[PDB]
Design a protein around this nucleic acid. Structure first.
Length: 213
DNA sequence: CGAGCTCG
DNA sequence: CGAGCTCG
């Protein structure tokens, strides 16, 4: 599949910031610069595996628009694949994780707000997740102490991974272990159910929701 | 939006 | 110990 080919590829060590003079500067523990990196590392992979499947790859002309990458076969436009890069970290190892997966009031509700292409033209919503555990010369690369260790990857459907609680107007993912994400041990009984649930979020959870029917 | 801290 | 407040 295109999915398969991507997954396989995904299955990520930065050293630092390099200077034209060859000078290398170790980076740091800023939880923000890092999420930007997992996105630099990605662009190429997604790009390469797509092209080898006759798919043009689109990026938003403006920050703050979904999703990170739009995929499609020029031939067919009402069948797009939206890829979004998500990142998270752990303080210890093998803890339960949780992500933030978007706004529950944008396109999800109005079809056009904040999305690159009209939500209705998108057949799938993948989430590539990355989990991590919280001068120099080209030769010393092995000496630059990294800013985090033991990274993990997973390709997955947004609705599968989707939670019922809300971030802290953003959607929260389930609050599980890395294994549960890969497998797809979610909460919603479907995309339809995901949609509906999140479209009518002002019910206070998936159980209270089913009853609400 | 994400992160350090608090207080019950 | 952790949900949430409050500050970046």
């Amino acid at each position: 599949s295109l999915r398969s080919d991507l997954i396989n590829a995904l299955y990520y060590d930065v050293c630092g910031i390099i200077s034209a003079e060859g000078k290398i500067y170790p980076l740091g523990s800023d939880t923000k610069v890092l999420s930007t990196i997992f996105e630099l590392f990605s662009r190429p992979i997604i790009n390469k595996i797509a092209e080898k499947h006759g798919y043009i790859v689109e990026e938003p002309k403006q920050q703050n628009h979904y999703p990170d990458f739009t995929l499609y076969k020029p031939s067919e436009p009402n069948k797009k694949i939206a890829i979004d890069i998500k990142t998270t970290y752990t303080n210890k190892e093998n803890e339960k994780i949780k992500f933030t997966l978007g706004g529950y009031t944008s396109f999800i509700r109005n079809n056009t707000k904040n999305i690159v292409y009209p939500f209705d033209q998108y057949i799938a919503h993948w989430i590539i997740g990355y989990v991590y555990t919280r001068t120099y010369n080209i030769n010393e690369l092995n000496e630059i102490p990294k800013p985090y260790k033991g990274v993990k990857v997973f390709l997955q459907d947004k609705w599968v991974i989707a939670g019922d609680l809300a971030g802290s107007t953003n959607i929260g993912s389930i609050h599980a272990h890395y294994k549960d994400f890969v497998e797809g041990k979610g909460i919603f009984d479907s995309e339809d159910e995901f949609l509906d649930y999140w479209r009518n979020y002002e019910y206070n959870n998936i159980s209270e929701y089913r009853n609400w029917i």
